[PDB]
Design a protein around this nucleic acid. Sequence first.
RNA 1: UCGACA
DNA 2: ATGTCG
Length: 132
Amino acid sequence: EIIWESLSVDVGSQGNPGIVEYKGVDTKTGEVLFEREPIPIGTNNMGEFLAIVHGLRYLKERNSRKPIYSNSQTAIKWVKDKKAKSTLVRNEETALIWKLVDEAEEWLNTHTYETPILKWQTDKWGEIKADY
RNA sequence: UCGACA
DNA sequence: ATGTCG
Ligand SMILES: [Mg+2]
Ligand SMILES: [Mg+2]
């Protein structure tokens, strides 16, 4: 019941909070379609959120109707809400990630999409294909 | 008091 | 260990 014709996204970090990056891959082939340059400080859930929104933008720009898989129940909710409810402190070190989050929320508030955002079922299917 | 997703 | 929701 895996929808193979899909984009899978995941976060990787060093620390949490710590250095965050994320990437999007073709679920079928594992081909890397996008990978964000590491952000010096962020949280796991911020990165999982940014990964989904990046995926939406990526598919929208390419007129693709593929769903997105994420394993993050938090990020899936934040996207649905158009609101990333992070409690990461705001300072000069976290300014960059908070700016990307704000801009992601803004994108969600200014664009439509029909992309299904699906939960990757890790316990049944193993690690998401975008895992680091 | 947890349970769960990461 | 921490970030998050049910
Ligand atoms: Mg994940
Ligand atoms: Mg992972």
